[PDB]
Structures are given as structure tokens and as C-alpha cells.
Amino acid sequence: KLFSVLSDQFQNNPYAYFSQLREEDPVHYEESIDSYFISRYHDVRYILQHPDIFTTKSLVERAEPVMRSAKRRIVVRSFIGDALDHLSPLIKQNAENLLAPYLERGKSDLVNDFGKTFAVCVTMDMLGLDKRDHEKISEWHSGVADFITSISQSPEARAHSLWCSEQLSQYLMPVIKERRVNPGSDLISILCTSEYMALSDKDILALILNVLLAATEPADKTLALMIYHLLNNPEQMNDVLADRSLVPRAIAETLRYKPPVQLIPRQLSQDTVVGGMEIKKDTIVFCMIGAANRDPEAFEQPDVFNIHREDLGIKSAFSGAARHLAFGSGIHNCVGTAFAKNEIEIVANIVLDKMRNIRLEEDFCYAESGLYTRGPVSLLVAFD
Ligand code: HEM
Numbered sequence: 001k002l003f004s005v006l007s008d009q010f011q012n013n014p015y016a017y018f019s020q021l022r023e024e025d026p027v028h029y030e031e032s033i034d035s036y037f038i039s040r041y042h043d044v045r046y047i048l049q050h051p052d053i054f055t056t057k058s059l060v061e062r063a064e065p066v067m068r069s070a071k072r073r074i075v076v077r078s079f080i081g082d083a084l085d086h087l088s089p090l091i092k093q094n095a096e097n098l099l100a101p102y103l104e105r106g107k108s109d110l111v112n113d114f115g116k117t118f119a120v121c122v123t124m125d126m127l128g129l130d131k132r133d134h135e136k137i138s139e140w141h142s143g144v145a146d147f148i149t150s151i152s153q154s155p156e157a158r159a160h161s162l163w164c165s166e167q168l169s170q171y172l173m174p175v176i177k178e179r180r181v182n183p184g185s186d187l188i189s190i191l192c193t194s195e196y197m198a199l200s201d202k203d204i205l206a207l208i209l210n211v212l213l214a215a216t217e218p219a220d221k222t223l224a225l226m227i228y229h230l231l232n233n234p235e236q237m238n239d240v241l242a243d244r245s246l247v248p249r250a251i252a253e254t255l256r257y258k259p260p261v262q263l264i265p266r267q268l269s270q271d272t273v274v275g276g277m278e279i280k281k282d283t284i285v286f287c288m289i290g291a292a293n294r295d296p297e298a299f300e301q302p303d304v305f306n307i308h309r310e311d312l313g314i315k316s317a318f319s320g321a322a323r324h325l326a327f328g329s330g331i332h333n334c335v336g337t338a339f340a341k342n343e344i345e346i347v348a349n350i351v352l353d354k355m356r357n358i359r360l361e362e363d364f365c366y367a368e369s370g371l372y373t374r375g376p377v378s379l380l381v382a383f384d
Pocket residue numbers: 048056057058059080210211214215216218219222255260261264326327328329332333334335336337339340341343
């Protein structure tokens with residue numbers, strides 16, 4: 001009400017405030033910006049579904065601080081689509097290879113020891129980049145990610161964030177040149193050789209930069225969240241162990257329960273009616289994905305993790321018509337929706353295979369972090 005959704009208070013537990021929010025301030029104004037925060041599922045869904053009214057940035061336009069088209073989406077989605085079938089044995093090696101230094105101990109941090117690196121490597125194979133360079137890239141990507149996600153930064157952090165993109169630009173630009181004339185099967189090569197959008201070098205760089213940011217954070221977060229909540233509801237865990245075809249459902253319900261992307265920003269092109277209030281001209285609104293997925297008017301007993309819930313719409317959970325809104329909704333939702341599913345299902349399965357008797361480490365302290373994107377700080381697990 002006179003509360004704030006950027007505060008340390010909110011950032012600590014966003015779910016503790018969602019009910020109040022859609023019940024008495026469904027169009028919550030913030031002081032800093034200059035932006036409105038929208039909590040009611042119906043209002044959120046309406047916005048995503050209507051891009052002509054609620055605009056976002058183009059795929060080929062750069063990163064910008066979040067807080068402070070011509071339809072390549074299809075074309076790109078088809079590419080990501082032809083890709084996954086030759087990439088699947090590579091997602092598999094990655095998983096297997098990165099877990100291998102931990103099996104001996106019977107102890108890992110799924111977030112830090114495995115997740116972040118895993119996600120980076122998968123995106124690297126998509127882009128066709130040499131995985132010897134995985135540490136350079138994972139570092140550079142955080143700089144950029146931080147400059148995007150953060151409210152405020154220190155002079156040192158901004159310095160490091162600009163150094164990071166300077167390095168990526170200098171790293172990826174000589175590759176675009178290489179593959180403009182000697183293409184392969186990788187995503188960069190396909191972007192270079194069209195043949196449907198005849199993109200320039202600067203544009204391609206921007207595009208893959210966006211693919212890099214998009215396809216990386218949400219993957220590891222999801223894996224960690226799903227494993228945490230499966231383990232927090234150990235008898236759901238046992239159902240999953242006993243039938244692996246449930247994994248996709250476990251994924252979806254995690255996406256619902258605790259969406260990785262917590263905010264989808266949009267900007268108006270026209271004075272429009274949203275909920276009850278009237279919002280003016282061309283200012284920005286934030287779709288509170290977390291508020292939407294917990295809405296009693298969208299899901300029954302919505303604050304209950306349940307992978308067997310009848311109103312999940314599994315048949316649709318990984319497309320434009322998903323009931324949950326973790327990928328967004330409509331013709332502008334996640335482009336890598338089919339890819340994300342396949343990835344998380346594969347990793348998940350390897351994890352459960354090689355980590356027999358997985359339990360949460362004792363005195364592990366579950367804690368979440370981030371406003372725009374959000375995941376566990378750590379996930380300390382013990383296994384045979
Ligand atoms: C489960 C993991 C993921 C989640 C929760 C997620 C979520 C999202 C969301 C909420 C958006 C904004 C959609 C909108 O504007 O309505 C988005 C955009 C996007 N996603 Fe995903 N995503 C995931 C994984 C991936 C993966 C693995 C890929 C690549 C294969 C990918 C590719 C993209 C791309 C290319 C965009 C466009 C961003 C831009 O236009 O700059 N995503 N994603």
C-alpha cells in the first residue's frame with residue numbers, strides 16, 4: 001500500500017505479500033520509477049497477450065537496466081527447434097561430466113558446484129563455442145547479467161560490467177566473421193546464413209547476447225528449485241523416482257510455484273485501462289509473475305506445491321497457451337520453451353540417477369535472492 005516491492009523486506013520473501021497485493025493494490029505504484037507493478041493474474045495475462053498495446057524490446061536490441069518486431073521469433077524458434085535433437089547427447093555429456101568430480105564425496109552444491117556451469121555449457125554448444133573457455137564466459141555473463149538485473153551498482157561493479165561486455169564483443173565478433181563464410185550447424189552460423197531477416201554483424205552479436213542471457217540463468221535456477229521442492233515434499237520425490245515420465249510435470253509445477261523470471265517489463269504505446277486504474281501515455285509496467293501464479297482465481301490451493309494438480313495443463317505447459325506464466329503468455333512468450341523443457345528433463349534425470357539417496361544436507365539453510373530473476377543462494381545436498 002505504502003509498502004514497496006523493491007525493498008529488502010519484499011526481496012526477502014515476495015510470496016508473503018502477493019495476496020495483499022492483488023487484493024488491495026493490484027496496480028501498485030513505485031516511487032523510484034515511474035513504473036507500476038501488476039499482481040492480478042487476469043491483468044498480467046491480458047498485458048502479455050497484447051504486445052501491440054504493451055511493447056517490449058526487439059530481439060536484436062541490446063541489454064539495458066531493467067529497473068532503471070518483424071517476427072524472427074518464429075524463425076529463431078524453428079532454429080532452436082532443429083537444434084535440440086543433435087544437442088541432446090551434448091546436454092547429457094555436460095551433465096555427466098560436471099557431476100563426475102562430486103560423486104566420490106557424496107556432496108554437492110547444485111547451484112554453485114554444478115548448476116551455473118552446466119547452464120553455461122549448454123548455451124555454449126547451442127552457440128557452438130569451445131567449452132574449454134567456459135570459465136571466461138561464465139564470468140563475463142554475470143557482469144552483464146548484474147548490470148541488467150540490478151537496481152543500483154557500485155562504480156567497481158559497473159566498471160566490471162562494462163569490461164565484461166567489452167570482452168564478449170571482442171570474443172564473439174571474430175566468430176561471426178568466421179561463420180559468415182564458413183558456417184556449421186551451430187546457432188550463430190544459422191543466423192549468419194539467413195536465409196529468410198538478413199541480419200548484420202552488430203545485430204547478430206546483440207541477438208546472441210540476448211540468447212546468452214535468456215537461456216542461462218533460468219535453467220540452473222529451475223533445476224535447483226524443482227529439486228528443492230521435490231525434496232521438501234519427499235513423498236512427491238518418491239513418485240518422481242518411481243516414474244520418470246512425471247519429470248515434465250515436476251518442472252512445470254516448479255515454474256508455477258516459484259517462477260525464475262519474477263518480472264516481465266512492458267511499455268505502453270497508448271493510454272490504456274488496466275484493472276481499475278488508468279495508466280498514462282508510454283510508461284512502463286511490471287508483470288509480477290510470482291503474484292500471477294499464486295492467484296486463487298487461476299489455480300486452486302495455489303500456495304501448495306503439487307506436481308499432480310489437475311489445473312496445470314501439462315499438455316500445454318511448455319507453449320504459448322500455458323496456464324502458468326513463467327515463460328510469459330502469447331505470441332511473445334519464451335522462444336526457448338521447447339529447449340528449456342528438454343534440457344531440464346535431461347539434467348534432472350541424470351541428477352536423480354547418479355545421486356542415489358539424495359537428501360538435503362543437515363543445517364543447510366534454504367534462502368532465495370534477486371528481484372527480476374530469482375533462485376536459491378545455494379543447494380547443499382548429500383547422497384550415496
Ligand atoms: C525454464 C527456463 C526459462 C524460463 C522460465 C524462461 C522465461 C522467459 C521469459 C519470462 C521471457 C520473457 C517472455 C515475454 O516477454 O513474455 C523469456 C524470453 C526469452 N527466452 Fe526464455 N526462459 C527460459 C529458458 C530459455 C531457454 C533455455 C532459451 C534458449 C534456448 C530461452 C530463450 C529465450 C529468448 C531468446 C527470449 C527473448 C528475450 C529477448 O527478446 O531479448 N529461454 N524467457
